[PDB]
Amino acid sequence: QDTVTKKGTGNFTAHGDIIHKTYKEEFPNEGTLTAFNTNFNPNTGTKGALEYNDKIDFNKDFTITVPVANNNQGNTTGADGWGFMFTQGNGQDFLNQGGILRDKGMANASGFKIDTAYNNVNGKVDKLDADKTNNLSQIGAAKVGYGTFVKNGADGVTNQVGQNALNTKDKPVNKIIYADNTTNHLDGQFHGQRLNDVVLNYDAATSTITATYAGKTWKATTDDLGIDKSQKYNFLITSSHMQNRYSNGIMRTNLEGVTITTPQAD
Ligand SMILES: [Ca+2]
């Protein structure tokens, strides 16, 4: 099958807390990495998005690949995670309303999240984080989170949709160990603080998105996500760091290896 690919800073628009720089000792194999959440402010928290400049057409196949490197922080102090979000709205709306990583964000937004935080506002826990059976039971110092597709309702409220992870023995099923203390660049164990690909592979014939990350696979249909295949969508890569957290929540990608690949056929 012949495909076309767009990538890199020329094809994404930054919104909010996004910077670019080298990390020579920690990522000597890499060029310019793109960092979210570096504007640290425990009074407000922070957030950022990268918005793809072209529309997503859910009547045709696509594969989206995003290299991510997670903060090496426990789930009560680090960043909220990564939200790979499809929406009729834009990055400006996201800065205004929020995304898919918390309790509520942009109305009708949907997509895949890597949730790296146990979010608790004075004893009120984000609903999906409180799901000890499917999602999350290790809280505090653990660098433990979870993956899942999600859909924001007409009211913005985030709900879990699609399938639980399809190829795992982990308990909870959706678990992701998103970082550890390894600094070795060659070691072949999975290390979520190093760069690892998120792959979103959409099959138009079956209306199904497959998400692969950390060797785990999730699936959701356009019907699960509320996606109208007759309408073109925007795609955003999002991250955020909650207020009242007192160490860095820096989350990084390599934008020149963020690829949006589609058939050359119409
Ligand atoms: Ca969370």
From Swiss-Prot:
Protein encoded by which gene: pls
Bridged cysteine pairs (disulfide): none
Stretches assigned to coiled coil: none
Localisation per UniProt entry: Secreted, Cell wall
Known role: Could have a role in preventing adhesion at some stages during an infection.
Name of the protein: Surface protein
Transmembrane annotation, as ranges: none
